Every structure is written in structure tokens, then in C-alpha cells.
């Protein structure tokens, strides 16, 4: 019962064991003879809920009555993990849960692994979404999470033969003791139809799905304080008989799965239909919430777009501001331009969202003439501010011609926001030096950095209570909603004690996940070894390629000296592919297949074994990223505008091998470069190489032992019942290379040489890992959402208790 | 007022504790204040408060069923028409009184409340809601006793009318979430589809798997502290490009979908077939999972299959499908087995309602049911052969398989070859199966066949829906009538008193305004309550005759006209009913029946002396408000078409007079009453018989009935649709030349026997101590009745109201 998880007072405990009494029995229907271990679980979570109730309920009301401006945080993906520990650990109600379940003979976090994950998001942007709602919660802003309740979330990958098999994701199979369905705020959104012109544009003839609104508490840490998350569910409105019953299926189907869609667009009328849909739900709400005139609306609303998915609330805006409130155009659109805001999260063009025009025509005919009107404006105002700039006009324009002209998602949300950040200020750089350079130069104002975080609560206190523990021994438990604090920790350097006990918190942590994969995997790694985590999602960008040239070259130096030391390493790598990405598919296999020969080869044993972590999730990532020693964050420079998993890595008391790329270059700054191990071509040195063309066959006509790799690769070294099965990756490497893994080989080889001889020192290491936990605290989202608000949304925050 | 003693006591304790838990509900539940609580949440948060009060008892009941290890029986049905659950949750454990006090307590209206939940729906009409009562006279009578069926997402349609012409709207009864349901994810079972069937014995493989997920309601006994189990299982999807994939599970989830809306029709879908052997599957799993907590020797001994129709007649060759594979058993142990468990209960005579699956539709579906069945078959015909040597066209007549272009599976063959017992519904359809429709099966095997005469519980269907007509009763006789209905035999002695008289009409004529005020506050329907309340609901078919109905209702209408100044007893004539979606027929009356009150309910000379009006979305919820109001209960089916009724039993309970013909269990009901007690008509089952043996000519009616003449030409020519005045070209033909149900045999004796209602309607005193002789003989008519006998004469198990403690 560590301080840090609250008190366990007798009459709390006594309270909490009553209630988890009653509603086993009234709400689950269970006596002790026949409850099953998910009763239990089930009967824990009502128990906690409850304590949600009236804060939920006196929150919602003081925002109603102090009337702040409310912030409608807008994304297509909330990727939230799991609840139950969360709500205690922000209501001081863990240790006295843990003691009422001990009491009652049960083990609370067995209860806890029986929670399914909230997986409504891919990864970094959706991730982000669930920390922002946690850390506004914290800084008691009147901020809503507004999202499409997904059926099934991202896809359960089962890893059968080597391959990644994708399962769905059946989250809600048992029920969600977490949402409040409100079927009373149910709101019809339009599709199709056409559009008449008179005193004004009218949209009929449409189709109508219902929009049901579910409600899930967000509470912030210990104040009092629960924010709502409402996530959007698709109802039908109200051959033959039986066959249009059945039909219904088809509107429904809108919410229905989470597109696996990971920085790379699809063009999918399905996904149109799931961005519109939210977008449509949620303005209604919004608007409805505002008349309890519209020169106050952005007085008191403001809208941020989490990237171009849900885009089309600005034109939707419009729509409802122009067509139904009957504001004047140029009054609207004043109103609109100061209420949206956009976060971009990635400058790789296959990610871009590029709409064909027939398809909005024919989905979203009012939108479409609201966009190119929009188009026209904003032109005439480019034209204006660089006349006679016939080209600038053609790389500005909304519009995009072609074989199948577009619209250009991006440029509409530039030209319907007031503010356009990136997520960390190399990213923020890039943006204004050339992807949106021309945006950049007619509106300068308009571009801001906000450099991405993650939250302390989830990702130190839920996560590692044993590293939050040692820290608030030292300087107390502020730290939590104030992460700089942490810097305090700069000053135990050179202590004895923190050194140990720091170095005691990994080890126990490392013990922790080698148990949990060998009791649901029946795997097992030995916990003396450093390990070595790659885990974010598979793609050619991330370069997990990369990380296997690294283990390929471990390999073949133990089997051309095996008698020499090396330190023993567990080499850990985890994620998923996109279900139409072959390329990443492929990757996984490989990872595995390195795995089959390297985990037999008896002359390696323990000093070497590659793994491949199945279903990388938030859960597992809580799991994995405390037991890590390195962290590995080497993507090409220029191409990961910021990452999270690196905050995350060395909030926990891991050591990052990384590029200059994202905010790995503010961790480093904050760190110190010396306390870092950064490698690697620079965003520079890359362009340079592109200016004079990349050709990988260069760096293997050099480099030995990056040709021994490829040959084993082509050969059938790593596959020989198939021995051409990785011809795919070897061609895309020397010939097709979009991410120059030969380019950047020989320094990560030479930079993990020397985490290695690093690693052999664990006093320097520790202190090394020391200055690094010391200097995260730039990386809490608390700072993120402060900046947000002070620098976009015209709010403060306050961490002000709540009576 | 309201809090009458049969609602039982509103207790200081109990009303303080109910009032302090309805508003923990609301928060803690609901998450809502008295500020922005709707009024369905404060339906939700009583509804939570009450359910409170089943939970000690289900768990407790299910727990002494465990250590008892009573024989289980287990009723299967495709249909569960249960109507609502809250006032018979509180009705069954003595709460009404104690919550309308708290709920009065707290500013609301119980009854207000108490209408916004949603029917659960999930059957079509009688065979539904007998399941129903059945499932409340087996808790009430202490039996260890499951329901099966599926949870459809959609139950049986609402019926809007619009334009005089039925609509046909979802019914998304699980929209706002259902309190009175208990997920059982636990008991989830696999179900398999197609495949193949392979030999090492059998095996059947490579099949399609669709999840089955149980949902438990409960079922309160009356006052015993009983509370057994309605297990339906919902469909599932399995968790084994990828966006079509994940779409793509809708396809086997469909199969919980929607109830389909065929009333005694079968239509042969594949997705029909599908949810038949998806509930047996699932429950014969969960019966046999149970049993083993392996000798099946004494599997009879502890389960009972009762067969709800052949909808659920797959439970015999799955029986043994698991029985020889799975636990390979031999087979004639295992047919022993089988047909020792298995019951099964024919619902109606009529040819288009049977089910005859083809080969090629089972093959596929279900290659190692088929299998078993020809298997079955053989032994069968093989023992008809022995028993009846060289009579072959018997052996055609009886076989499981019939010949054809199409060939197909007699599914109610199968039912008697794998059942020790097969009864009918009432004495009169019983005895028709061993006659004729079953003669051969009955000749065979005698002592196969029985009777079991449909009940209604007393409870939903007297104390429920008419508590003042329960009250008045209780004054004189006490309140064991309530489980022990023959009781009402006692208020014969009351047939001469003053005040008996009185407070029986006083009670009609209230449940009439109330009824009136019901069609004024949700329609803006004007209707007299000083008139005769003339009822007809029940599905739309041409067996039941809304037709001949109608044919009165105009006779009536045109007598007015020639004689306008002429006297006569004000009627209110109410016809309900919901037609399936494609009977194009069924449609058409619906449509009749609007445009005959178009012209009647805007004729300035008739008024307020008679109207014609068509009750929207007839339901159990709707039965429970119309019944209590009715005066006449119109039972009206042709001779031998209608196998035992049980609306008509609600009216008897409920103080309606009945005009009927000797069909069904209305041969019953004027046998316990006397017939000078009712108003009966028309042709016997000899008269249709003998008829059908000379030919009906509809012709030789019309030339001989002028008033009979005058209608159809009205009909023909336009009077009652000058708009379209074609438009019911339709029924007069079929009337004319192709009516299979005897319009015009009857319609004589009909409208004079009406104009005896009438006469006598004259006559109050007489009108109210005729009611009185049928009230007091309505016992014979308590599905407790029924279920005492299923379980003595059938399920070998003794019944007993004992409470539990
Ligand atoms: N919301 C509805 O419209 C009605 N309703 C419920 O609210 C349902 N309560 C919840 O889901 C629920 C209460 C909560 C407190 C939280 Cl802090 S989170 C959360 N969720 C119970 C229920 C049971 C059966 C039918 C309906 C309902
Ligand atoms: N489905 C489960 O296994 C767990 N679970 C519930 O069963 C749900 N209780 C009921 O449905 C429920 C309790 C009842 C008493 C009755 Cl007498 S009837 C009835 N029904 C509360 C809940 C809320 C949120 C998530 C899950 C759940
Ligand atoms: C934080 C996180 C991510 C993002 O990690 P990156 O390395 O920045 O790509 C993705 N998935 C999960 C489950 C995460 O927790
Ligand atoms: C009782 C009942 C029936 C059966 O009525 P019959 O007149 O016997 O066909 C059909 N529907 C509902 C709603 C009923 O309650």
C-alpha cells in the first residue's frame, strides 16, 4: 500500500466492501457460490462508478453556470485504454479498493486484466486524443471528447506462423460499465440528396441515420472534476418486411469498425460517411448547447480538428450557420474561421486526405458547393496578396486537378482555422518551410508549434506506481499535475540510495512482464538481460527494418566470434500492421522468422533472443514500456512529426537510441545530447541525399556486413522451406528505398555499441537514466493543453479542487 | 382512488424504502436529478427499484432447484409474446399498492409510468402469448421450468394506419435498454451451419459457427416467492478485405434479427430454418450441460421438451444427433431417450400453416439432420409396416417424407414419431387430429394423443388489467380465486344480487370512459361510452371473418338508413389486428374496414349510434386496456379453422358476453357457462363438412339474401371507396367464388343472432346477471389449469402453490 495510491481507512473500506457486496448481487445478479471472476471485475467497476456520479453531475452543472468558453476537442479516434484503474487513481481510490478486495479475497489486479481495452484509435494521434481529455480534465477546463463509438475498435492481432492474423475487435461483447448511453440527445444527420437555391440554399430528399450519443466520464486527478468524452453510435431511423428490417444494418454500419488506417488514406465512401457523421452530430450539439446571436459563438466555442479527418466541420459550419441560421456568408465565415482549429500529424503525402469530387457530389452535394465557394475566397485573397502568382494559386487551391480531381483536405482546414500547429517544433518548422510554406507566407500568424505530451497519471502513477513511488519519497506527490517538479531529481544524482532503488523499480518491473509473457504466452526471457523495446506501429517510415539489420548484425558477430562477450540483450519488437499494407505484413514476419533462427541457434542461448510482442495495445504498452531499458525511435529524419511512445519511454526510466527526428529532438535538448543516444543523418543530410538521388546499392558494395545481411535475406538464411519470401523487402531496400534504412546502418550499429558498453556500467547507466526521468516533465500533456489553451482556444486553465 | 385491498399493502416501511432506493436508482443508476429527469427516467428508475425486489428470490429458486434436482422441463418456443413487465413484477410480489404510495409520495403518476414501457413483442399472437401464460402458471404453480426462445432485436411490428392502409414500422423495443433482461455471456454456445458430414461414427465438420448468447428474464410466481428463467439467445458473430469481413458478421447476426410476421403461414425462408435450429441448438446444449451436473438412462427422468408447434421440432433429430455422435450412444438407446423427453403441441389444422422443409434447403443447411431424419424415418415406416402389413398407401400417408417436384420434410410427422405425446389445444381440435388430420399416427399409437384446452393467466389477464372487476370479486369470495380461478364459481350464488349486479356494471362502464379516455388522449378519437362496446381483436385472416364482422356492420348502417327514425342500441364496433406484411387479402380487410367507418363515422343521420373504428397496433399492451372495456367479444372463426382461441377466454374473464360459433374452446366456454349464457351461431364442424362434401356455391346465398345483395353491390359498385371504386373488386370475388371460410353460409344467423345482443343489451339487469353466469364459470380457462395437466398427464411432474420461503 504505497503513498502514492492513497489511504485504505477503515470506514472507507468498510463502505466499498458493501457496495461491491450489493451490486454483485442486485446489478450482477451473483451470489458467492456461482460469481465468475468477470462478476467480480464487474461488481469492482459499478463500485467505483458511483464515486463518479455526483462530481459528474456537479461538474456538468458549474460549467453550465460560470458559463466558460467550452472546448469540443473533435477526432475520429479515442484511444483509451482501459477505465477502472484510471478512475481510482484520479479519485484516490486505489489503495482502499485493494484493501476492500483483499478483504474480500480477491486479488484487484487479476480483476483489472479482465477489463477489455477502449481501442477506438490506431496509435500516436488517437493515443493523444486520451491524454489530452485526461490532462483537460486536470486543468478543470469545460472540454468535450467528441468521437464515433467504433463496435469494434483496432483489430486483435493473433500472430499464427510468424504472420499477423487480424481478429475483431469485440470490445463492447459483455457490456460498458464506463458509457452512459443518452438516447434522448439522439440527432439525425443527412446524407445524399440534392440541394434547391431560392432566400437561400435548401438540402432535401437526403437519407437520415440517427446519431445516438454515448457519455463516458473523464475525471481529472484529484479534483473533483469529470469531464464527458461522447462518442456517436449509428441507429436507423424509424425482399419485403424482412429484407428492409435487415437494411438497417447498412446505415448502422457507419459505426461499426475503426478504419486500421494508420498515416496512409484509403478513399473510402464508408469513411467519408463516419467523418461527416461525427462532424454533423456534433456541431448540432455544440449549436444547441450555445442557444442554452452568433457574434459570441466563438466567444464561446472552439473546435479543434485532431488532423483532416473530421475537416468537414468547417464547411459543415457553414452550412448550419448560412443555410438554417441564416447568417450572411462573409459574417459566417468569420465565425467559423475563429471557432476551427487543426492539428496536422504528418507530412507524409500518402497520408493526406484528397477527396474525389464526384464522390462528395454525390454523398455531400451542399458541402461540396460550400467548398468550392470557400475556394473561391480564399484564391481571391492569394491573388490579392501575390498578384499575377498563377502557380502559387494552383498549389493553394482546395481543389486538385487530375484524372480524378479532389479536394485537398489540408488547404480546406488552413483556410477554415485560425490557428495550424504541428506537434513538435521541428514538425512545426517543416510545415512552414515547405509542405505549407505558400499557407505560411500569405497568413504567418496562423502557425504555431504544440509540441505533443502524454499523460503522468496513465503513464507513470497507473503504470510504474513502484518509479512514482521512489520519486514522491523524495520530493512529494505535486509532481503528478506538475511534472517539471521532476528537475528536483537532478539534485539525487549522485544519491546512493535513489541510484539503487531506481535500478531496483526497473528490475521489478522487468521481473513483472517476464512473468506475464510466460503466463499467456508461455514465453519466456530472462529479466538479466537489457531490453531492447521497439513498440509504435509497423511501417516503412518507423523503420522496424532497421532494427532487424541491428539484430541480423548482433547474430552474425556471435557467430563469427562466439567465444566473445557481448551484453545480453532481449530484443522486443511490437506492433500492427495496416490489414492492406503487404509491406508491413512482410515486416512482421521477418521479425519472427529472425526470431525461429536466432531463439534456436544453440551457440547464442540467453545472450541473444528476438521477439515479437503480440497485440501492442495501451494495456500492453503499460505493461512493456516500464520494463524497457532502450527505447527505440529511429525514424527517418523528417518523416515522425513528433511520437509519444518516446515521452513515454523516458517518463518510465528507459534510455532512448533515436534520430533527430519529432521530439526526439526536444527530449535530447531537454536531457542533455550527452545524456542520449542519438545517431544518424539529420532532416538536412537526408534532403541532401535526395537532391543527389539515394542508391542503397552503394552502401552494400561497402559495407561487409550489410551484405552478409541481404544475402541470408535473398538466399533463404531466414526462410528455407520458402526461400525467396523476403525478395519483396530486399528489392524494396536496394532499388525502392523511400526511407534510406542502408543510409543510416553504420551509425545505429556503432551508436548500440555503445548502449552496450554503457549497459556494462549500471551505476552510469542508472545515473544516466536518472537525468533522464528528471528532465521529462516538458512532456506532460498538462503542458501541451495549457499551451493549447492560452495560445489557441482563449482559456486558462486552473487545477483549482472542485467543492 | 385506487389503493384497493387486492393491490396488497402500502406499508410506512416499505414505501420509505422504496422512495429512498427509486432515487438512489435515478442517481446512481441514471445519473439524473429531479431538475432534467425525463419522465422514462423515472419509468427506468421504479423499473430498477422493483427488479431489486426479484433478485433474493431468482437466485434463491435457482439455487433450490440445484440441491432438489427436480425433473427441469423445458419449454421451447420460437415465440414469447410477454407483453410488459413491470406491473407484473409488482402485481406477482404484492408491490403495486406500496409503489403507487411512494411513487404518489414523490409527485408522479405510476400509471403514467407504467406506459412508457415498450410490449416485448417476440411472438405474432395466440401461440406467443400461450407461451407467455404458461411461463407465469409454471412459477406459480412451483415447477422447475425454463422458457426458451430467441431474443429478437425486433419484435412483432407496430402497425401504423395511415390513409385507412396498414404500415409497417420496426419494433425496436431494446432501444432505450432493457432492465428486465440479464445477460448470461458465460453460457455462450457455439452453433453450427452447413458443412458436411464425415465418417471414422459421423461427424459433422467444416461448418460456419454462429455464437449464441444467453438473456435471462425473470418469471415471478404469484406470491410464492418463486422466480424461474426465460432463456432467449441473441446471435453472435464468431471472432475468427478486412472492413467487408467485420461488416460482414451482420450476416449470421441476422439471424436473432427479427420475429417473422407469418400467423399460421408458412413461407419456407432459410432464415426462418436458421433461427429454428439455432434455438434448439443452443438449449439442448445448455439441457445437456445441466443433466451432467453420464448416464442418459435417466435423462427423461430430469428433462421434459415441450414443443411449442413443429417450429422447434429439429430438438428431435439434434437429440439424437448428440446423443449417437457426440456421446455415442447407440441408436435405439438414444431414440428411447428422445422420445421419452419430448413432447409436442399441434396449434392448428389448416394445411398453409404446416411446415414442409425441402431436402435440397436441409441438405445444405443441416446434411447430418437430414440424415438422421431419413434414418428416423425408416425405423418409423418400418414399424407402421409391421404393424399394418400391405398398406402401402398408409406408409405414403405417414412418412416423414413427402413426394413430389419438391420434396419435402413433414416436420409435424417427425413430431409424433420422436414425441410420447401430442396433444391439441382444446377438446373439439383434439379430437379432429385423431379423426382425421392424425388418424393414421392414432391408429398406430393410440396412446400418443391428448387433450390440453388452452388457459390464460388470471393474473395479467383478470387482476392486471381489470383490478377493480378483481377487487368487486375479492369482496365476496376472498382472494384465493387469484391462483385457484375455479373458485369463481362461488359468485354463482351472487347471480340474484342486488349490489353483486350493480357494482359488476359499474365496474364495465368504468373500464369503458377509461378505455374512451385512452382513444381521445393518444388518438383524437371520439367514441360514446353509453354504448355497446362491440370487439373484435385478434390477427387479420379470413379463417377469423373481420369479414362477416363487416358484413354486419353494414347491414346495421344500411337498417338505420331505411329507417331512420327507428330506435337502435347504440354500438361502438372496434375491429383490431395486424395482417402480415404480403397477405394481400388480410391487407385489404384492414383497408375495408377504415373505409366503412369513413362513410358510417360521417353519416349525420347515424352519429353517436353506431361507429366503426379500427384500433391501431393491436398488442398485448392494447388487449389489457380493450378487454376490460369490452361488452361483446366477437369469436367468430368458421367451424373446425380455429383450434382453441384464447382472446376469446380474456373477454369471458373480463365481463364481455361472447358472440361466437361452435368452434374451439368456445365449445368449452359455453359447456362450463351454459349455452343459454351464449350467443351462438352458424354452422357446427358438420355443417362446414358436409357442406364441403356437396360444394359451397356462395352464389345460391346472394340470390336468396337481398339485405346480403345490397352490400356487395355497395361493395362492387364503389359506395365505400368512390375515389377507387374498384378498389375492393378483390374481396368481392373472393367472396363470390373462392371463399374457403363460408361468408354467406353464416351471415344469416349471424346478424339475427347479433340482433339477439342487442335485445337483450335492452335489458341491463338481465345483460349484467348473464355476465355474472360467465365470470363465475371462467375458471376451466386458467393456464393453471393447462399447466397442471402438462405436468401430471405429460411432464410427470406434481405441481404445488407452496411459497418458497
Ligand atoms: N442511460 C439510459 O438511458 C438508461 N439506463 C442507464 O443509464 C444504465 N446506466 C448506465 O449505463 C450508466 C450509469 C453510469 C454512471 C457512470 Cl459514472 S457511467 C454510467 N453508465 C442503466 C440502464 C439499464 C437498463 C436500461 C436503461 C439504463
Ligand atoms: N451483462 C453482464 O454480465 C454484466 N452486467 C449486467 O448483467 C447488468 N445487469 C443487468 O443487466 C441485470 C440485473 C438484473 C436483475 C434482474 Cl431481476 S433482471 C437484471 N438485469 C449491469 C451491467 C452494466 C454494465 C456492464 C455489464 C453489466
Ligand atoms: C503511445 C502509443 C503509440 C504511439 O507510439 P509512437 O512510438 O509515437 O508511434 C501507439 N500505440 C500505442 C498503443 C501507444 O500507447
Ligand atoms: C390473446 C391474444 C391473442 C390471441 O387472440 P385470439 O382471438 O385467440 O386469436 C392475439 N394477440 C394478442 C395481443 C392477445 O393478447
Not at 432535401?204 to 475525471?219: F, G, R
Not at 498578384?387 to 483556410?415: F, Q, T, W, Y
Not at 506506481?465 to 506527490?477: S, V
Not at 521529462?776 to 500533456?781: L, W
Request: proline content about 4%; charged content about 25%.
Amino acid at each position: 500500500q504505497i503513498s502514492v495510491r492513497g489511504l485504505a481507512g477503515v470506514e472507507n473500506v468498510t463502505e466499498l466492501k458493501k457496495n461491491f457486496n450489493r451490486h454483485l448481487h442486485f446489478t450482477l445478479v451473483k451470489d458467492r457460490n456461482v460469481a465468475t471472476p468477470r462478476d467480480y471485475y464487474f461488481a469492482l467497476a459499478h463500485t467505483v462508478r458511483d464515486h463518479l456520479v455526483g462530481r459528474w453531475i456537479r461538474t456538468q452543472q458549474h460549467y453550465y453556470e460560470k458559463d466558460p468558453k467550452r472546448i469540443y476537442y473533435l477526432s475520429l479516434e479515442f484511444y483509451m485504454g482501459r477505465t477502472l484503474q484510471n478512475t481510482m487513481v484520479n479519485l484516490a481510490l486505489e489503495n482502499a479498493c485493494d484493501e476492500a478486495t483483499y478483504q474480500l479475497g480477491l486479488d484487484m489486479e487479476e480483476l483489472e486484466e479482465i477489463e477489455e481495452d477502449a481501442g477506438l484509435g490506431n496509435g500516436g494521434l488517437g493515443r493523444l486524443a486520451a491524454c489530452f481529455l485526461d490532462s483537460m480534465a486536470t486543468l478543470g477546463l469545460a472540454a468535450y471528447g467528441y468521437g464515433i463509438r467504433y463496435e469494434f475498435g483496432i483489430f486483435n492481432q493473433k500472430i499464427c506462423g510468424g504472420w499477423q492474423m487480424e481478429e475483431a475487435d469485440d470490445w463492447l461483447r459483455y457490456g460498458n460499465p464506463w458509457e452512459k448511453a443518452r438516447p434522448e440527445f439522439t440527432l439525425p444527420v443527412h446524407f445524399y440528396g440534392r440541394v434547391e437555391h431560392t432566400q437561400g440554399a435548401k438540402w432535401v430528399d437526403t437519407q437520415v441515420v440517427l446519431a445516438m450519443p454515448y457519455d463516458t466520464p473523464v475525471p481529472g486527478y484529484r479534483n473533483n472534476v469529470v469531464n464527458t468524452m461522447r462518442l456517436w453510435s449509428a441507429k436507423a431511423p424509424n425482399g419485403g418486411y424482412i429484407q428492409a428490417v435487415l437494411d438497417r444494418n447498412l446505415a448502422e454500419n457507419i459505426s461499426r469498425v475503426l478504419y486500421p488506417n494508420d498515416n496512409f488514406f484509403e478513399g473510402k465512401e464508408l469513411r467519408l460517411k463516419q467523418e461527416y457523421f461525427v462532424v454533423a452530430a456534433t456541431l448540432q450539439d455544440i449549436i444547441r448547447r450555445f442557444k442554452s446571436n452568433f457574434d459570441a459563438f466563438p466567444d464561446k466555442v472552439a473546435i479543434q480538428l485532431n488532423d483532416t479527418h473530421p475537416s468537414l466541420a468547417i464547411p459543415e459550419l457553414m452550412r448550419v450557420l448560412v443555410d438554417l441560421e441564416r447568417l450572411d456568408w462573409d459574417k459566417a465565415w468569420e465565425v467559423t474561421v475563429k471557432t476551427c482549429a487543426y492539428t496536422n500529424h504528418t507530412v507524409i503525402p500518402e497520408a493526406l486526405e484528397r477527396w474525389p469530387v464526384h464522390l462528395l457530389e454525390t454523398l455531400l452535394p451542399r458541402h461540396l458547393q460550400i467548398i468550392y465557394e470557400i475556394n473561391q475566397r480564399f484564391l481571391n485573397r492569394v491573388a490579392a496578396a501575390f498578384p499575377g502568382d498563377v502557380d502559387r494559386l494552383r498549389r493553394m487551391s482546395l481543389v486538385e486537378e487530375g484524372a480524378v480531381k479532389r479536394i485537398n483536405m489540408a488547404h480546406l482546414c488552413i483556410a477554415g482555422s485560425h490557428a495550424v500547429n504541428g506537434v513538435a517544433r521541428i514538425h512545426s518548422e517543416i510545415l512552414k518551410k515547405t509542405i505549407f510554406k505558400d499557407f505560411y507566407e500569405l497568413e504567418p500568424h496562423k502557425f504555431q508549434n504544440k509540441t505533443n505530451g502524454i499523460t503522468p497519471r496513465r503513464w507513470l502513477v497507473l503504470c510504474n506506481p513502484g518509479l512514482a513511488e521512489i520519486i514522491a519519497e523524495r520530493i512529494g506527490e505535486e509532481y503528478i499535475s506538475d511534472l517539471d517538479q521532476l528537475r528536483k531529481l537532478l539534485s539525487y544524482v549522485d544519491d546512493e540510495a535513489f541510484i539503487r532503488d531506481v535500478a531496483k523499480v526497473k528490475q521489478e518491473n522487468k521481473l513483472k512482464f517476464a512473468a506475464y509473457l510466460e503466463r499467456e504466452y508461455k514465453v519466456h526471457i530472462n529479466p538479466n538481460s537489457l531490453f531492447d523495446v521497439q513498440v509504435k506501429r509497423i511501417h516503412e517510415y518507423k523503420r522496424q527494418l532497421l532494427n532487424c539489420l541491428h539484430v541480423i548484425t548482433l547474430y552474425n558477430r556471435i557467430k563469427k566470434e562466439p567465444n566473445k562477450f557481448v551484453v545480453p540483450r532481449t530484443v522486443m519488437i511490437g506492433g500492427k500492421a495496416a490489414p492492406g499494407y503487404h509491406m508491413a505484413k512482410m515486416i512482421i514476419k521477418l521479425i519472427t522468422a529472425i526470431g525461429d533462427v536466432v531463439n534456436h541457434d544453440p551457440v547464442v542461448g540467453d545472450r541473444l533472443r528476438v521477439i515479437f510482442l503480440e497485440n501492442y495495445r495501451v494495456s500492453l504498452a503499460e505493461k512493456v514500456i516500464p520494463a524497457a531499458d532502450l527505447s527505440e525511435q529511429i525514424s527517418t529524419a523528417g518523416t515522425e512529426a513528433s511520437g509519444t511512445g518516446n515521452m513515454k519511454f523516458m517518463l518510465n526510466g528507459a534510455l532512448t537510441i533515436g534520430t533527430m527526428d519529432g521530439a526526439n529532438v526536444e527530449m535530447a535538448e531537454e536531457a542533455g545530447e550527452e545524456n542520449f543516444f542519438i545517431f544518424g543523418m539529420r532532416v538536412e543530410d537526408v534532403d541532401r541525399l535526395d537532391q543527389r538521388g539515394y542508391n542503397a546499392q552503394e552502401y552494400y558494395d561497402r559495407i561487409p556486413e550489410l551484405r552478409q545481411i541481404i544475402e541470408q535475406l535473398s538466399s533463404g538464411f531466414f526462410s528455407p522451406k520458402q526461400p525467396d519470401l523476403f525478395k519483396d523487402i530486399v528489392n524494396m531496400l536496394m532499388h525502392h528505398d523511400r526511407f534510406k534504412v542502408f543510409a543510416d546502418y553504420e551509425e545505429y550499429v556503432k551508436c548500440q555499441e555503445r548502449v552496450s558498453a554503457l549497459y556494462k556500467n549500471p551505476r552510469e547507466w542508472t545515473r544516466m537514466v536518472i537525468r533522464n526521468i528528471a528532465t521529462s516533465g516538458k512532456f506532460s500533456s498538462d503542458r501541451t493543453i495549457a499551451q493549447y489553451a492560452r495560445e489557441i482556444w482563449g482559456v486558462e486553465p486552473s487545477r483549482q479542487r472542485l467543492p
